[PDB]
Enzyme design. Structure first.
Site, short mmCIF file in Angstrom:
data_model
loop_
_atom_site.label_atom_id
_atom_site.label_comp_id
_atom_site.label_asym_id
_atom_site.label_seq_id
_atom_site.Cartn_x
_atom_site.Cartn_y
_atom_site.Cartn_z
CD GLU A 1 -3.18 -0.73 0.18
OE1 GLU A 1 -3.10 0.31 -0.49
OE2 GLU A 1 -4.04 -1.62 -0.02
CG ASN B 1 -8.76 6.64 -4.33
OD1 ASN B 1 -9.00 6.82 -3.15
ND2 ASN B 1 -7.87 5.82 -4.74
CB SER C 1 -12.07 9.29 -2.02
OG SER C 1 -11.65 8.17 -2.76
CG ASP D 1 -6.61 5.45 -1.02
OD1 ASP D 1 -7.70 5.45 -0.58
OD2 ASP D 1 -6.40 5.08 -2.14
CG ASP E 1 -15.85 -3.09 6.91
OD1 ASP E 1 -15.46 -4.27 6.60
OD2 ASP E 1 -15.75 -2.13 6.10
#
Ligand SMILES: [Cl-]
Ligand SMILES: [Cl-]
Ligand code: NA
Ligand code: NA
Length: 129
Positions: free
Chosen positions: A35, A46, A50, A52, A101
């Protein structure tokens, strides 16, 4: 900060990620490598607007507030900049929420494509933990 592999493993272990929701330490180290290349200051934008943030590339559509992702949520209750700290606490605490989640580590696309089903214990081999 750019962590070393064993240094990161130790830090994640101290913060309770080893076997958290059944994911062994090497899984978290593998995900961080792909990552962010272990760099806490990593950011990536993105297509949806958005962004990251940080060692685990936590997205501003759901998990943090950056003031520029309209219609987003902030489920970790933190500014996204907190994720870029040399102190990984905020990243780790938010990651525990994400992995809880429903989708497990499949939330991290790099984990699913690069770590899942591989010998992840190789990422902590040799480390003093
Ligand atoms: Cl926003
Ligand atoms: Cl990928
Ligand atoms: Na992060
Ligand atoms: Na947000």
């Amino acid at each position: 900060k750019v962590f070393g592999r064993c240094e990161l493993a130790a830090a994640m272990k101290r913060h309770g990620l080893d076997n958290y929701r059944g994911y062994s330490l090497g899984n978290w180290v593998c995900a961080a490598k792909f990552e962010s290349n272990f760099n806490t200051q990593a950011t990536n934008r993105n297509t949806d607007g958005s962004t990251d943030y940080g060692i685990l590339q936590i997205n501003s559509r759901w998990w943090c507030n950056d003031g520029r992702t309209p219609g987003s949520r902030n489920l970790c209750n933190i500014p996204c900049s907190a994720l870029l700290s040399s102190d990984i606490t905020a990243s780790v605490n938010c990651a525990k929420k994400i992995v809880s989640d429903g989708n497990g580590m499949n939330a991290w696309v790099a984990w699913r494509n690069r770590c899942k089903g591989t010998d992840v214990q190789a990422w902590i081999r040799g480390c003093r933990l």
